[PDB]
Design a protein around this ligand. Structure first.
Ligand SMILES: Cc1cc2nc3c(=O)[nH]c(=O)nc-3n(C[C@H](O)[C@H](O)[C@H](O)COP(=O)(O)OP(=O)(O)OC[C@H]3O[C@@H](n4cnc5c(N)ncnc54)[C@H](O)[C@@H]3O)c2cc1C
Length: 149
C-alpha cells in the first residue's frame, strides 16, 4: 500500500461538526471531539487506509503514528497486528467483521463490539462506531471511527 496523504492535513474538526450536525442520526453517539480515540480512513484509496489517527487512539492501541497510518485498521484484529484481507479470523467473530465490511461498503452508519489487540498483545473489547463523512465535494469520501475500550 502506498497510501497518499492529503497535503495540509485533514479537516477533522469540520468533520466532527458535520457528524454532530447530521440530520439522519441512525446511531446516536452524543457530543464528540478530538480528545477521544478517533481515526479517519480514505474510502477512495485502495483498501480504505487510515489517513489520520488522534493521539488518544495511538495511546489506546499502543501503536505509533507511523505504524498505523496507511494501513487498513483490520490489523488490530490480531495480537501480532497480522491480518490478511478476507481471511478467517481466529479470535474475532466472523459475523461481526462482515457487518463492518458491508456497512462501510454501503456508506451506512454502524456500531459494533469487536475484539482487538494492543501493540503489546493485550486483548480488549473495542466499542466501535463508524460514520461516513462528506468532503468539500459533497459526497462520501472518508469514514470516521470512534474507538472505545
Ligand atoms: C474509520 C474506520 C475505523 C475502523 N476501526 C476499526 C477498529 O478500531 N478495529 C477493527 O477491528 N476494525 C476497524 N475497522 C474495520 C476494518 O478496517 C475493516 O473494515 C473490517 O474488518 C471489515 O472489512 P474486511 O476487509 O476486514 O473484511 P474481510 O477481510 O472480507 O473479512 C470478512 C470476514 O467475515 C466473514 N464473512 C464475510 N462475508 C461473509 C458472509 N457473507 N457470510 C458469512 N461470513 C462472512 C469471513 O469469514 C471473513 O473472515 C474500521 C474501519 C473504518 C472505515
Amino acid at each position: 500500500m502506498h497510501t497518499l496523504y492529503a497535503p495540509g492535513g485533514y479537516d477533522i474538526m469540520g468533520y466532527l461538526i458535520q457528524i454532530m450536525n447530521r440530520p439522519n442520526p441512525q446511531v446516536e453517539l452524543g457530543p464528540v471531539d478530538t480528545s477521544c480515540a478517533l481515526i479517519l480512513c480514505d474510502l477512495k484509496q485502495k483498501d480504505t487506509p487510515i489517513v489520520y489517527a488522534s493521539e488518544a487512539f495511538l495511546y489506546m492501541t499502543g501503536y505509533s503514528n507511523a505504524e498505523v497510518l496507511g494501513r487498513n485498521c483490520r490489523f488490530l484484529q490480531s495480537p501480532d497486528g497480522m491480518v490478511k484481507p478476507k481471511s478467517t479470523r481466529k479470535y474475532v467473530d466472523s459475523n461481526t467483521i462482515n457487518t463492518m465490511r458491508k456497512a462501510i461498503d454501503r456508506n451506512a452508519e454502524v456500531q459494533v463490539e469487536v475484539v482487538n489487540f494492543k501493540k503489546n498483545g493485550q486483548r480488549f473489547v473495542n466499542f466501535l462506531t463508524m460514520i461516513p463523512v462528506r468532503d468539500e465535494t459533497g459526497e462520501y469520501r472518508y469514514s470516521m471511527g470512534f474507538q472505545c475500550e
